[PDB]
């Protein structure tokens, strides 16, 4: 049962090994401590363990061995959750894609103030005068050409320096998924149509008894192929020549030549073909003559689309962290800028919520982001939870719209009147 | 009925051929003894057999021939099982993958002490001070970067030498299978989606009587091809030339040349193509006009996954055996390190349980591991069984999790309203 770093600090009142009246500190959790020992322990500082052993701070190489000292047994006795307080989905007023996206990007309470605050906790640098932990006095929120948030340059002041830098938040290339029945596409319209091909046929059934269906099967297949090969060839030739020459016609210059040829080659390539292959088969239980018509065509298609509530959010932040100026531990301080991943949408290795959980459990997997735990030393990591919740929660609002694409193949089958036949 | 080496030692009290009052020792089982004669017999020592014959120890070449002597008839009269005492599956507290795996790797009673003890019986070297047959005083259990168990270097002492070596146990690359209904994947979410293609169509059925369905069949096929060829060519050319030259224009330098060419080549190659080929066919028993829409798309898919109990364990040990310093018999003592297979999961030739059984039966098949029987000489092989059971038994605990993968193809079929048609 892994112990979270939050409460892990020293219990001042406690004695430890001599009888704390708490649940014992053990070896299993003790080994798990190594990566954040600096947070908990002073260089020389010593801490105990229930099996009659002790831990030492960063000053020493120390293995887990015998000693006497206090520590937290208290926290392990009653662990606390660590969870996000509320997952609830946000409801924003509905509209069209332009406006809905804007409202989301515009929201001070729902987007900006919380995103900025989260940024503040996470390491982002500050700019100029301040009002609270988020968006400063001079700071402002305007739109980038891309639709992202941006501010004016003139004032400057990042980290209290005259440089031009400003924080920006990207709008995502939105992607959504919808579990419910709540959305729909309307009737199609063909802007333009060209007719590629037609095929017609019929079944003639004069006789009374034998009645059977007819099958027309088509295939329209077009394909492209691409390949490249590289060949290496080596030629070895040894030759000898004599000048005796044979009187009739040996040849004055008589040469014999042997050539050995070796060549090898490797290649790769591939092709893709698309086929439109319709099959029509009328059962036609009637004594008749039945025309059938099968059509292939190309067209421009457009559909109006009914409003859909859900949207997924992809966020990566700006590169301000390098300016950040906070105690790092995991990373060295470096000038060159690095964009930090915020992924809200579910990508397991990328997503922030998981990383938050992972930091609590402690897992040594591969990582490329600044960790969550250093906030505990710096800010305490309390009462922040709602702020994180603001960023993490799903947001939805109905956006009505269009469905359109490049011109596509389409097809059709028409059936005629089964004309009465007689013998 | 093969006799196990366990009880096979000499019966001190017995006379043997003269009338032991036990079931007879026979030739069939006697021949099976050769590979472990050294355990049972002294160099000169002699042992009997019921058909009036005798066996001799390693000092002699001895065939099975006449003589008089005692042996065990006693054990063969009443054989004992040799089995693992209990197969029962372990129950560990549930959780997420990070924590469940940890708890398993952390368990002193269930994992470490028994695994170490098993290692001790099997030939693994010891380190420094000891407390019992398993994990020594100085020895400790901490985590490797990989998640494996490791300990500190400073103290040293393997086999009582200052060298750095320490024992390590690998966490497996977990693999599991589940017979029961007990697990599930939740609703899918699409992180991102790109639409590859769309095809639309309809069946028009104005006339009252003829009603029949419509079939749209698609194929999207993409493929890659790779190949390499090597060609060898040999050229043999004999030429002759004369300088007579023909007055009009024979050519002053008149040459005739014959070239024989031989070439051959061999090649190998292959290609793979994947096709997405949907078929949609509405029966549509109605007089109507029915639109159909078929879609191909690409997307990122993610599913939350319900907890699953079972996990299979793959274990191979460290390379400590070379340091081991025990009586070998089968293998020569060598310095270079060799990792020894522990396979818990079922791989027939690899698995430990089978090898244990195989050692009891005696089978000369190909083998690449230290055998089980030498433990009998060294430790007696008693009361160990529960320890082996600790390692061998299946372990399970529900791990909830995610299901994710690289972006994949997906598709969809939509059907329209069958619009009433009239003649």
Q: Are strands B279-280 and B149-150 parallel, antiparallel or unpaired?
A: unpaired
For A364, the closest of B106, B145, B223 (CB atoms) is B145
Supply B67's token pair.
């003589």
Report A:52-81 residues touching B (Cβ under 8 A): 61, 63-64
Q: How far apart are CA A390 and CA A117, in angstroms?
A: 10
Instruction: Please indicate whether, in this complex, the C-beta atoms of B219 and A277 are within 8 angstroms of each other.
Output: yes
Alpha-carbon separation of residue B235 from A256, A337, B103, B211, B386 (angstroms): 11, 64, 72, 72, 76
How buried is residue A90: exposed, middle or buried, by Cβ count under 10 Å (0-12/13-18/19+)? middle
Cross-strand partners of B201: A411, B292
Q: What is the DSSP string of B114-155?
A: HHHHHHHHHT---BSS-SSSSS-SS---EE-TTS-EE--STT
Of the candidates A363, A84, A77, which has an alpha carbon nearest to the alpha carbon of residue B99? A363
Provide the b/e sequence for B33-63 (b: ≥16 CB within 10 Å).
beebeeebbeeeebbbbbeebbbbbeeeeee
Of the candidates B187, B132, B91, B107, which has an alpha carbon nearest to the alpha carbon of residue B397? B91
Of the candidates A173, A181, A119, which has an alpha carbon nearest to the alpha carbon of residue A309? A181
Q: How far is CA A111 from the centre of its chain?
A: 21
For A408, the closest of B199, B225, B414 (CB atoms) is B199
Instruction: Please indicate whether, in this complex, the C-beta atoms of A176 and B190 are within 8 angstroms of each other.
Output: yes
Cβ atoms of residues B305 and B184 within 8 Å: yes
Residues of A within 8 A of B256 (CB-CB) are: 249, 251
Alpha-carbon separation of residue A164 from A153, A155, A321, A357 (angstroms): 5, 8, 15, 36
The Cα of B249 is separated from the nearest Cα of chain A by a number of Å equal to 17
Cβ atoms of residues B282 and B382 within 8 Å: no
10 Å Cβ neighbour count for A9?
15
Q: How far apart are CA A190 and CA B187, in angstroms?
A: 35
Return the DSSP state at A344.
-
Cβ atoms of residues B62 and B37 within 8 Å: no
Report A:176-235 residues touching B (Cβ under 8 A): 176-177, 179, 185, 187-188, 227
Rounded to the nearest 10 degrees, how much is the dihedral formed by the CA atoms of B90, B96, B99, B105?
40
- What is the 3-state secondary structure of B154-174? CCCCECCECCCCCCCECCCCC
Q: Which residues contact A112 (CB under 8 A, 6 or more apart)?
A: A134, A135, A141, A149, A169
Residues of B within 8 A of A346 (CB-CB) are: 189, 191, 302, 402, 404
Taken in order B392, B149, B404, A398, the sign of the CA dihedral is positive
Cβ atoms of residues A105 and A149 within 8 Å: yes
Q: How far apart are CA A302 and CA A406, in angstroms?
A: 10
Q: A196, A244, A255: best mutation site toward chain B, by most B Cβ within 10 Å?
A: A255
Establish if B419 touches chain A: CB-CB under 8 angstroms. Answer: no
How buried is residue B108: exposed, middle or buried, by Cβ count under 10 Å (0-12/13-18/19+)? middle
Establish if A268 touches chain B: CB-CB under 8 angstroms. Answer: yes
Supply A251's token pair.
């040849």
Residues of A within 8 A of B141 (CB-CB) are: 27-28, 31
Instruction: Please indicate whether, in this complex, the C-beta atoms of B203 and A259 are within 8 angstroms of each other.
Output: no
Place of tokens 């019921």: B50
For helices B113-122 and B385-392, angle between their N-to-C axes, nearest 10 degrees: 120
Phi, psi of A383 (to 5 degrees): 70, 0
In three-state secondary structure terms, B28 is helix
Establish if B12 touches chain A: CB-CB under 8 angstroms. Answer: no
Return the DSSP state at B63.
-
Establish if B302 touches chain A: CB-CB under 8 angstroms. Answer: yes
Longest CA–CA span in chain A (Å) reads 122
Cβ atoms of residues A29 and A2 within 8 Å: yes
Task: Kindly give the residue spans of alpha helices, DSSP state H, lying in A327-412.
Answer: 352-361, 374-378, 385-392
Compare all CA atoms of chain B with the CA of A239 and give the residue at the minimum distance.
B237
Alpha-carbon separation of residue A45 from A40, A54, A171 (angstroms): 9, 11, 48
Phi, psi of B157 (to 5 degrees): 95, 30
Residues of B within 8 A of A248 (CB-CB) are: 242
Instruction: Please indicate whether, in this complex, the C-beta atoms of B219 and A251 are within 8 angstroms of each other.
Output: no
Cβ atoms of residues B143 and B149 within 8 Å: yes
Residues of B within 8 A of A295 (CB-CB) are: none
Method: cryo-EM
Resolution of the experimental structure, in angstroms? 7.4
For A250, the closest of B140, B151, B240 (CB atoms) is B240
Counts of helices then strands in chain B (DSSP H, E):
8, 17
Supply A194's token pair.
């060209």
A-to-B residue pairs, Cβ atoms closer than 8 angstroms: 244
Instruction: Please indicate whether, in this complex, the C-beta atoms of B242 and A258 are within 8 angstroms of each other.
Output: no
In three-state secondary structure terms, A284 is coil
Residues of A within 8 A of B263 (CB-CB) are: 261
Place of tokens 């490791």: B150
Establish if B241 touches chain A: CB-CB under 8 angstroms. Answer: yes
Q: Which residues contact A185 (CB under 8 A, 6 or more apart)?
A: A303, A304, A305, A306, A403, B414
Establish if A283 touches chain B: CB-CB under 8 angstroms. Answer: yes
Residues of B within 8 A of A270 (CB-CB) are: 222-225, 271, 273
Q: How far apart are CA A417 and CA A286, in angstroms?
A: 11
Instruction: Please indicate whether, in this complex, the C-beta atoms of B212 and A346 are within 8 angstroms of each other.
Output: no
Return the DSSP state at B105.
H
Q: How far apart are CA B386 and CA A380, in angstroms?
A: 49
In three-state secondary structure terms, B215 is strand
Q: How far apart are CA A396 and CA A415, in angstroms?
A: 46
Of the candidates B201, B195, B225, B196, which has an alpha carbon nearest to the alpha carbon of residue B213? B201
Residues of B within 8 A of A261 (CB-CB) are: 231-235, 263
Task: Kindly give the residue spans of alpha helices, DSSP state H, lying in B285-418.
Answer: 352-361, 374-378, 385-392
Q: How far apart are CA A221 and CA A168, in angstroms?
A: 49
In three-state secondary structure terms, A359 is helix
Report B:143-182 residues touching A (Cβ under 8 A): 143, 145-147, 151-152, 154-155
Q: How far is CA A343 from the centre of its chain?
A: 8
Task: Kindly give the residue spans of alpha helices, DSSP state H, lying in B212-296.
Answer: none
Instruction: Please indicate whether, in this complex, the C-beta atoms of A412 and B199 are within 8 angstroms of each other.
Output: no
Instruction: Please indicate whether, in this complex, the C-beta atoms of B210 and A284 are within 8 angstroms of each other.
Output: yes
Alpha-carbon separation of residue B173 from A131, B89, B147, B313 (angstroms): 51, 20, 11, 8
Compare all CA atoms of chain B with the CA of A187 and give the residue at the minimum distance.
B416
Place of tokens 């990383």: A355
Of the candidates A224, A376, A406, A228, which has an alpha carbon nearest to the alpha carbon of residue A302? A406
Place of tokens 């609703």: B187
Cβ atoms of residues A76 and A3 within 8 Å: yes
Establish if A97 touches chain B: CB-CB under 8 angstroms. Answer: no
Provide the b/e sequence for B352-363 (b: ≥16 CB within 10 Å).
beebbebbbebe
The Cα of A164 is separated from the nearest Cα of chain B by a number of Å equal to 34
Alpha-carbon separation of residue B281 from A85, A197, A240, B157 (angstroms): 49, 21, 76, 75
Q: Is B405 left (phi over 0), alpha (psi -120 to 50) or beta?
A: beta
Q: Which helix (H) or strand (E) holds B75?
A: helix B74-77
The Cα of B116 is separated from the nearest Cα of chain A by a number of Å equal to 16
Q: Which residues contact A78 (CB under 8 A, 6 or more apart)?
A: none
For A278, the closest of B151, B216, B302 (CB atoms) is B216
Phi, psi of A281 (to 5 degrees): -145, 105
Compare all CA atoms of chain B with the CA of A264 and give the residue at the minimum distance.
B230
Q: How far apart are CA A3 and CA B99, in angstroms?
A: 11
Phi, psi of A106 (to 5 degrees): -80, -25
Compare all CA atoms of chain A with the CA of B216 and give the residue at the minimum distance.
A278
Instruction: Please indicate whether, in this complex, the C-beta atoms of A263 and B233 are within 8 angstroms of each other.
Output: yes
The Cα of B47 is separated from the nearest Cα of chain A by a number of Å equal to 54
Cβ atoms of residues B192 and A172 within 8 Å: no
Q: How far apart are CA A235 and CA B300, in angstroms?
A: 52
Instruction: Please indicate whether, in this complex, the C-beta atoms of A175 and B193 are within 8 angstroms of each other.
Output: yes
The Cα of A217 is separated from the nearest Cα of chain B by a number of Å equal to 10
Q: How far apart are CA A181 and CA B264, in angstroms?
A: 65
Cβ atoms of residues A84 and A71 within 8 Å: no
Residues of B within 8 A of A347 (CB-CB) are: 191, 300, 302, 404
Q: How far apart are CA B370 and CA B317, in angstroms?
A: 12
Rounded to the nearest 10 degrees, how much is the dihedral formed by the CA atoms of B145, B150, B153, B156?
-160
For helices A352-361 and A385-392, angle between their N-to-C axes, nearest 10 degrees: 140
How buried is residue B321: exposed, middle or buried, by Cβ count under 10 Å (0-12/13-18/19+)? buried
Cross-strand partners of A295: A198, A412
Instruction: Please indicate whether, in this complex, the C-beta atoms of A262 and B200 are within 8 angstroms of each other.
Output: no
For helices B97-106 and A352-361, angle between their N-to-C axes, nearest 10 degrees: 20
Of the candidates A34, A74, A75, which has an alpha carbon nearest to the alpha carbon of residue A55? A34
How many Cα neighbours within 13 Å face the side chain of B86? 7
Q: Which helix (H) or strand (E) holds A122?
A: helix A113-122
């Amino acid at each position: 049962e892994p112990v979270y770093p939050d409460q892990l600090r020293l219990f001042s009142l406690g004695q430890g090994v001599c009888g704390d009246k708490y649940r014992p500190v053990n070896r299993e959790e003790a080994q798990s401590v190594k990566s954040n020992i600096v947070g908990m322990m002073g260089q020389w500082q010593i801490s105990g363990l229930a099996n009659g052993w002790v831990i030492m701070g960063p000053g020493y190489n120390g293995e887990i061995k015998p000693g006497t000292a206090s520590n937290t047994w208290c926290y392990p006795t009653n662990p606390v959750t660590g969870e996000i307080p509320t997952l609830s989905a946000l409801d924003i007023p509905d509209g069209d894609e332009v406006d809905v996206q804007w409202r989301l990007v515009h929201d001070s309470a729902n987007f900006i103030k919380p995103t900025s605050y989260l940024a503040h906790y996470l390491g982002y640098a500050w700019v100029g005068g301040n009002h609270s932990q988020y968006v400063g006095e001079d700071m402002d929120v305007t739109r980038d050409g891309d639709g992202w948030v941006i501010r004016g340059n003139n004032d400057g002041g990042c980290d209290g320096y005259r440089c031009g830098d400003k924080t920006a938040i990207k709008v995502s290339n939105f992607a959504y998924n919808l579990d419910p029945d709540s959305f729909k596409h309307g009737d199609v319209t063909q802007s333009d149509r060209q007719l590629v091909k037609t095929v017609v046929g019929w079944a003639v059934n004069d006789s009374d008894t034998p009645q059977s269906g007819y099958d027309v099967t088509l295939r329209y297949d077009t394909a492209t192929n691409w390949s490249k090969t590289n060949t290496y060839g080596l030629s070895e030739k040894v030759t000898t020549k004599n000048k005796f020459k044979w009187p009739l016609v040996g040849e004055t210059e008589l040469s014999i030549e042997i050539a050995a040829n070796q060549s090898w080659a490797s290649q790769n390539g591939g092709s893709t073909t698309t086929s439109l292959s319709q099959s029509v088969r009328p059962t036609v239980p009637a004594r008749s003559k039945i025309p059938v018509k099968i059509e292939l065509y190309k067209a421009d298609i457009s559909y109006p689309y009914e409003f859909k509530a859900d949207v997924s959010y992809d966020l990566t932040l700006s590169g301000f962290l390098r300016w950040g100026g906070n105690a790092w531990y995991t990373h060295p301080d470096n000038r060159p800028n690095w964009n930090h991943t915020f992924v809200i949408g579910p990508y397991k290795d990328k997503a922030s919520s998981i990383r938050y959980q992972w930091d609590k459990r402690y897992i040594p997997g591969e990582v490329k982001w600044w960790d969550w735990n250093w906030t505990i030393q710096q800010n305490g990591l309390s009462t922040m939870q709602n702020n994180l919740a603001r960023v993490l929660r799903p947001v939805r609002a109905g956006i009505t719209g269009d469905f359109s694409a490049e011109s596509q193949f389409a097809g059709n089958i028409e059936i005629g009147a089964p004309v009465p036949l007689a013998a």
